[PDB]
Amino acid sequence: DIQMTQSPSFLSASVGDRVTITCRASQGISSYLAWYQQKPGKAPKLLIYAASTLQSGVPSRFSGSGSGTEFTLTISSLQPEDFATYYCQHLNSYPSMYTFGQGTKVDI
Amino acid sequence: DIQMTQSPSFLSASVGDRVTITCRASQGISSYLAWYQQKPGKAPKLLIYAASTLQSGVPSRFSGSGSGTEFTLTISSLQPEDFATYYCQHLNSYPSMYTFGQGTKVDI
Amino acid sequence: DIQMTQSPSFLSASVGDRVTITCRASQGISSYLAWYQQKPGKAPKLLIYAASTLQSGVPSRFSGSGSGTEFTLTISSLQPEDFATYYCQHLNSYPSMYTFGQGTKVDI
Amino acid sequence: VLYNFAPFFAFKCYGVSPTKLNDLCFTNVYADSFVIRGNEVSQIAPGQTGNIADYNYKLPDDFTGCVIAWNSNKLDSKVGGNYNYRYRLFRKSNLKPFERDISTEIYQAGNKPCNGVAGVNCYFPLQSYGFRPTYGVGHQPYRVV
Amino acid sequence: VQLVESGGGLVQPGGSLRLSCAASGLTVSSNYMNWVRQAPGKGLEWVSVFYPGGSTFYADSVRGRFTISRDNSKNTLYLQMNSLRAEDTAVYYCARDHSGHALDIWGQGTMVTVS
Amino acid sequence: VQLVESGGGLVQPGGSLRLSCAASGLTVSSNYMNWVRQAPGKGLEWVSVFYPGGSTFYADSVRGRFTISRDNSKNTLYLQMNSLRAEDTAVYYCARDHSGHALDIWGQGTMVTVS
Amino acid sequence: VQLVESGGGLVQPGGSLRLSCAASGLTVSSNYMNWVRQAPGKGLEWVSVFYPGGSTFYADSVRGRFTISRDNSKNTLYLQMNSLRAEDTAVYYCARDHSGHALDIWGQGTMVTVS
């Protein structure tokens, strides 16, 4: 069994600067990990999947690259609409399957 | 299997004239058929059963006679309280049993 | 099987005098019987259990003594807060177990 | 010799027959004796659940033996009290078949530690029968072997 | 003879209800009794049937989720349902059969909607 | 010791409810625990019982539809019901037995009405 | 593609609900479909999964009380629950899996509270 945890938890980031998020996986990990964005009171939408694949409709503003245990995502632009929450996952073996781990919060 | 259908569907009948209703049964039929009257928002009551048997409490105004595939009911009097809906049925074999068919509407 | 019944049913007792209550058990009885007090709209609380054992928190005002078929409880003091209802019980064999019997009412 | 001398109330056998008992051979024939309420004699049988069967004396399922019960209100009942006889009201778990417990330790009810004194939330497990000659046939003493 | 029916209300999809058919004048354990369904603004349909003997026939659309029961103690007829959003959205009727085809004593309907 | 009870409300006939008996001070897995029923303006009645061992006895009127359960994780007692119009129209009580006959710690009642 | 979900409301403890996942654009009988749970003000959790073949895996916390079903007639996905006070107090989501790990088409949540 593996446990997914995120270090930043709450953060404070201004419009001018960028934000970097990291989530760790115990006992190693494959290359399959997805990042989600969930504005409060809205169903979350896929943002980045697999190894920095990027998705149609997701702006090129977002880019999340990593390998092995250390995984991270970074936002380059000024974040006009201040984003709210972000999550990790990774599909597993029979008993656990989808593991999301603790959430993350970023704001002004 | 047999299918019960009624030809008139909606009708327009004045107080002065009479009204004749017919419902057909596919693949022939026995002599057992019942006619119901259902004023809107009220539980339907038996009007004519079997082969023009007539029922206690049903006025002699009503009389429905027929044989074989062609079945019909006729109202002789002027219809003071304009009736609303009417139905057929016939008990069948194991799978279907009571078959009511499409309804009928008559009004001013 | 045994049936538990109480003779007084409704009663009228003033503040000055005392009140005596009796409940009978058919086909004899052991020494285990409990008395309950239930003010209207409140969960009943144990008052006297076993053979006149008396209970902590129950005033010495109450005292219910009896043996065999004839069982009774008596209140000595003036009953400042007029009590309302009272019950008997006795644990039984497999089918019935707890038998409470008819209630009793006492008031001003 | 059982029938001729002692009249019986509930003479029952499981796995064996009464008449055909003499013409059979066994290596061990035990004999367990106690005194039970009349209405609680029926708990001495294969399986069953109750105050006596579960916590005092539990018979096995595949039981080969005989159960004998006969009334003793004439002799076992006392003048005004027979508090000598007791049964185990409180126990943590059921008994394995054919077991015995003679512990008189104070029972514990609640997560709070239980002291020696019974007081509140700690009870003396054993509870005393009440036997008097005027009691009904249900609560009358019985002898079971 | 009167057939007053009770029960109904609103039940969520996947829920359960029971309806009782109270009859004073005819024996439920002696007559052909059946359940008739009528969606709003549509024709009637047949649900169950219950013979004097221990027999019961159901329609195809109400088979396996609908169970009927009779109690001679209260002289009443019960229908047990494990509802579905489109299976039960109608008024329910209780009737008796005289001549093996005609339902005469129709009771007042009970609204049974699912939401 | 306190025995706070939760659950209740209104359930339609043929429905289902569960009531939990929260006890803080006594172990549910060590005492005689039982359920007591009281219809409005009437005497009390006995429903279930649950020994320290895996044993349970039910009254005749609540047998086969009423199931009791105990969970040592939450130190609470649960009662499962499959209600009927006259079987469950009463406040329900949770109690402990000291001396094999007397119920002392009676919790506050929970209203369980059917309609 | 849209995944509109229906059902919900309030169910008493020990009750039952069913939720339907309506999908117009993707075949439910051909894609990995799953149920995702989110308690208010907390992270997300996984409930069920349903392969193109007749296979289904449940989480440990929702095993034995939660049943999933698929109907190709209405092209919809159903989840059957036998609720508990802490097992089901969350919005429920319906999703599809593209590359065996990523859930893209997330439908609107349905509130399912127990009280």
Residue numbers in the entry:
A (entry chain D), B (entry chain G), C (entry chain K): 1 to 108
D (entry chain A): 367 to 511
E (entry chain F), F (entry chain H), G (entry chain C): 3 to 117
According to the publication:
Here, we firstly identify a human monoclonal antibody, 8-9D, with broad neutralizing potency against SARS-CoV-2 variants. We then determined the cryo-EM structure of 8-9D Fab in complex with the ectodomain of the spike from Omicron BA.5 in order to understand how 8-9D neutralizes the virus. We next assessed the antibody competition with human angiotensin-converting enzyme 2 (hACE2), which revealed that 8-9D blocked the binding of RBD and hACE2. The structural details of the epitope can be used to interpret the broad-spectrum neutralizing activity of 8-9D.
Two major conformations were obtained after performing a three-dimensional classification of the particles. In one of its conformations, the spike exhibits two “up” RBDs, each of them binds an 8-9D Fab. In the alternative conformation, the spike contains all RBDs in the “up” conformation and three bound 8-9D Fabs. The spike with all “up” RBDs was reconstructed at a global resolution of 3.0 Å. However, the local resolution at the interface in which 8-9D Fab binding is poor and the map is not sufficient for ab initial model building. There is a significant overlap between the epitope recognized by 8-9D and the surface recognized by ACE2. 8-9D covers ~70% of the ACE2 binding site. The bound angle of 8-9D is approximately 30° away from that of ACE2.
